[PDB]
Structure formats: structure tokens, C-alpha cells
Design a protein around this ligand. Structure first.
Ligand SMILES: CC(C)(C)OC(=O)N1CCc2ccc(N)cc2C1
Lengths: 237, 244
């Protein structure tokens, strides 16, 4: 009924690894132009999610083709967790990376479709009612990565076994944070359900953008379009 | 610490209700369009089996406590989404790891090659058989399958749901009962309950892939029957099924 020393290190490692992501500010370094803006910010996020994944214990020990299969499916879902995490209820603006804030209007101009857009903002609202801290969001990401039900996964039994300790850690953590509220932990897990719906909704949105002459870049195409040369390079180096 | 009398009743009548489902056999009663243009015969055979299953799931859902309390349009919205997911929970239940054959209704047993021969794509078939194997690894008893079906029916996340908070009002008691049931049954294994809830995540992917399968079949000149088209294609009979 209290976090083990092993579980405390795991959470600390994941939280510190999460802090490396989304450090790039709007000052920092560097209709149709608005689409090319989002892709570039997405590419930075994808790159950061790949490096995050390697730091998660057990991910590098899996076979290459499984690593890709997990990242292919989970990356958009990890992005949606992050957009929810620093969603501003007062302004109704979604933050990307450190400091890039966009209201629902800005997405409309980029050529995105209300079917895609409003469910994201709804999801970011619904997560707020939970009142999740940074440790919980971190464990939930790790749980999301090690999903044995993804397409083309060769070793489901391994992926399931790699997920188990993270589920146990979140069970313990939530029981300590809210002893009275036994059902908060289920409610958290039922957001993994919503992320799938959003994941397929996103796939319908990427396709609809292609019809209006808005193709994805090389990296974003590898993981979201209908060999993964660039993704291999990032998992190698 | 232990179960309530109310919960013991709820679970009991849920399992007794799911017993009435899947009673129809290959030998019994009327006969289905038989299993062998040859591929069309196999497609038609599956649709007739599926129609029967839909009609039992509707019946089942109507005798769940609190379902008939919801508005007609909401009943239809939950059934339209959940029916395929309830059907895949039933395939996984009676999967045979010995023969690697999925069973529909009582004893309509089909292998992975039989689905392939009916024109079904690998992007649909592989996930289904994996799900059945993945469910076996958990090892759910009757009561657990019954509770997980009731939880699946009352998902407030569904398309075109008008009263989502009243749907989730009905779900919470089934989550509580499953939490306590697993706690009593296997006190030493706490990770089992979360894993069961997380299968609802798997059932959403299967549903979307199932929708993709339904679409690709149209290109083979294999169009769904009226009742199946209402729920899976892109609700006159389903309205009529909900009244009795
Ligand atoms: C191929 C077709 C779209 C007609 O049907 C199915 O997808 N299935 C698989 C699920 C299922 C479940 C129960 C029954 N009786 C039939 C089917 C056919």
C-alpha cells in the first residue's frame, strides 16, 4: 500500500524524460502556409516521442519491427495526451511544444474539419475533470506505448508483459493519491478507449487533407499515410 | 470487503440472460444458407448468422436493468456501436486454442482459412484471432464476460448520444461490481481488472477495422442485408426490434 523503491525510480525516470520534450519556445531558433506550420511542429514532437520511447526500460530490447509498430500507432495518441495536459480551459487554446498556442479557429483555417477538431477539444476538457498530475500522464504514456493490440505486432505476449509493471505502478499511485476514490483509476484507463476513436478520426482527417492537395512530409507520411527509412534512422542513432 | 446482495443479484441475472444467447445450432430448427459465387455463398451464410446474433443482443440489452429507461434514440446509438464489440467478445469467449477455430452461435465452427475463402481481408482476420488469443491469456469466467458486456453497452463515448451522463450513471455500478468480483475471486492478482477494462480499447480498433472490412466487401459485389446495413454501413428495423 505504498510505492516501492523500484516504482519510485521508474516514475522519476519517466517524469524527467517527459520534461525533455516540449522545451522549444516560439522565440528560440527558427491557409496553405498554416498547414506547413503544423507539420513542422508535429515533426519536432514525433522526433521527441521516439527519443522518449528509447529511454523507457524494455523498449530498445524489443525487435525493431515491433518498435515501429508501437510508435506508428501510439505517437498521435501521445500527442493528444500532451495537448490535453496543458489545455487552457479559460482561453480554449491548445499548446504545442513549449509556447505555440492555437484556438479551435486556427485549426479551421489550416483546413482541418470540425469532425476531427471538436473531439480533441472535448477530450482535453474531459481529461481536466480527472485532475491528472505529471506522474500519472507519464505512466499513461508508457502504458500507451506498450499496447499489444496494435497492428502488425509480432510479439504481443512480450509487449503485454512490458506493459504490466506500468499498470501496477499507476494502480498503486492512484490509490495513494485518492484512497477514497477507488474508481478514478478505471476512469483514467477508459481514456485510452477515447484515444483510439481519436486515432482513427485523425486517420480520416489526414486522408481528407490529401484530397485538398496537402500531402504530409516524409516522416509524418511514414507513420500516418495509407519500409520506414527515416524512422529506422532515429531508432538507430 | 465482500459482495453486496444487490450485486450478487445483478451478476446472476446478467449471466442467466447471456445463457439464452447462442442457443441456435447447426443441426437444430430452420437451416441457414448453407456453407460450401462460392465465396458469395460463404458471405451470405455469415450475414444470416450475424443477423440472428444482432437480434439476440437486442433482446439481451432490453432486459439489462436501466437500458429501457433511456430514450429510444439513445438505445439505438449504444446498440449501433456496441453490437459488433459484443459479438467479438463472444467469439473470443468460445475460441478454441486447440483447433484455432472461432465459433458463432452454438456450434458453427470456422477456421482462419474459411474467413479468407469468404473474401475477408487479412487486416480484419488477424486482429480477431489475436484478440481471441489475448482474451484467453486473461482467462475470464462467465460472470466477468457478462459484466464486461454490460460495461461495453453503457459507454457514454458513443456517436450521437444525447444523454451521456445518464448512460455513465448506468455504467458505474457494473464497473464497481466487476472491481469487487475480481477482488474476491483472485485477491492476489490486482492487475487483472485493469487489463479487462483495457480490452474495451482493443474492441474500438476492431470495430473501426470491421467498418473498413464492411466497406471493402462492397467492391466484391457483397452488400450487407437491411438490418446489418442499418448498424454497420455508411434505423427502421432496429426501431421495430426495440418494441415488443
Ligand atoms: C463478414 C460480415 C461483415 C458479414 O460479418 C462479420 O464481420 N462477421 C464476423 C463477426 C460475426 C459474429 C457473429 C456472427 N454470427 C457472424 C459474424 C460475421
Amino acid at each position: 500500500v505504498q510505492l516501492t523503491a523500484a516504482q519510485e525510480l521508474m516514475i522519476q525516470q519517466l517524469v524527467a524524460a517527459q520534461l525533455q520534450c516540449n522545451k522549444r519556445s516560439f522565440s528560440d531558433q527558427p491557409s496553405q502556409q498554416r498547414f506547413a506550420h503544423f507539420t513542422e511542429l508535429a515533426i519536432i514532437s514525433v522526433q521527441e516521442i521516439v527519443d522518449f520511447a528509447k529511454q523507457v526500460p524494455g523498449f530498445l530490447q524489443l525487435g525493431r519491427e515491433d518498435q515501429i509498430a508501437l510508435l506508428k500507432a501510439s505517437t498521435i495518441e501521445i500527442m493528444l495526451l500532451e495537448t490535453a495536459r496543458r489545455y487552457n480551459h479559460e482561453t480554449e487554446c491548445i499548446t504545442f511544444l513549449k509556447d505555440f498556442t492555437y484556438s479551435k479557429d486556427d485549426f479551421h483555417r489550416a483546413g482541418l474539419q470540425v469532425e476531427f477538431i471538436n473531439p480533441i477539444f472535448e477530450f482535453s476538457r474531459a481529461m481536466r475533470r480527472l485532475g491528472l498530475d505529471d506522474a500519472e500522464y507519464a505512466l499513461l504514456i508508457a502504458i500507451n506505448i506498450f499496447s499489444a493490440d496494435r497492428p502488425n505486432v509480432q510479439e504481443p505476449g512480450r509487449v503485454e508483459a512490458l506493459q504490466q509493471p506500468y499498470v501496477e505502478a499507476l494502480l498503486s499511485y492512484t490509490r495513494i493519491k485518492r484512497p477514497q476514490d477507488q474508481l478514478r483509476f478505471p476512469r483514467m484507463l477508459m481514456k485510452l478507449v477515447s484515444l483510439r476513436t481519436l486515432s482513427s478520426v485523425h486517420s480520416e482527417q489526414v486522408f481528407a487533407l490529401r484530397l485538398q492537395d496537402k500531402k504530409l512530409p516524409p516522416l509524418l507520411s511514414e507513420i500516418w499515410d495509407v519500409s520506414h527509412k527515416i524512422l529506422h534512422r532515429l531508432l538507430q542513432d
